[PDB]
Design brief:
By secondary structure, this protein is of the alpha/beta class. It has a single domain, classed as Alpha-Beta Barrel (TIM Barrel). 46% of the residues lie in helices and 21% in strands. Helix 7 links the parallel strand 6 and strand 7. The longest helix has 14 residues. Bound molecules: chloride ion. The PDB classes it as de novo protein. Keywords: TIM barrel, salt bridge cluster, de novo protein.
Length: 183
């Protein structure tokens, strides 16, 4: 439900090469339209696995990249990966989540992401195999401080979710390279 202001801010930074835009939507056609407008990561999160995997398959047919899929269950992520998803988002917002990362690593996945509101959780996931660390802490004030800590720890691919362009901009300044906006 993001306003156009959120996309507007990430678009300006994306054009300057200062960020990648990740876009989440429940409709693959909306994801395709976003890809054509310059979105770099398309997040499928349909809870129905049949629909979600169908959305991954259709985005692959369209040539869209990079396709992401989000789940709390490594098995769903592994199926999405087989069907065309490149970025596998372990959702730790309701936790164990670290074990999902470990199993995906055992399966051979090398573009694992992890979504959490706590930098210490994200740091552990990073050590265990997650390469994209998603700070999603809209219920926590100044969550870009979590970005700052992960940046000092040496993580190279930090993403940040907010519906407010001001928060997105500050997270970029603190070291986020992927900004997540929503339909
Ligand atoms: Cl600053």
């Amino acid at each position: 439900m993001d306003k156009d202001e959120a996309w507007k801010q990430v678009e300006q930074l994306r054009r300057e090469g200062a960020t990648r835009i990740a876009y989440r939507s429940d409709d693959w056609r909306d994801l395709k339209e976003a890809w054509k407008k310059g979105a770099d990561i398309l997040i499928v999160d349909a809870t129905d696995k049949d629909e979600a995997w169908k959305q991954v398959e259709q985005l692959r047919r369209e040539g869209a990249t990079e396709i992401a899929y989000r789940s709390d269950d490594w098995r769903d992520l592994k199926e999405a990966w087989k069907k065309g998803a490149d970025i596998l988002i372990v959702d730790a917002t309701d936790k164990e989540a670290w074990k999902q990362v470990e199993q995906l690593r055992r399966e051979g996945a090398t573009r694992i992401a992890y979504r959490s509101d706590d930098w210490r959780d994200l740091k552990e996931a990073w050590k265990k195999g997650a390469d994209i660390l998603i700070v999603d802490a809209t219920d926590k004030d100044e969550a870009w401080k979590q970005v700052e800590q992960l940046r000092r720890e040496g993580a190279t691919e930090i993403a940040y979710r907010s519906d407010d362009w001001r928060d997105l901009k500050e997270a970029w300044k603190k070291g986020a390279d992927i900004l997540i906006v929503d339909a």
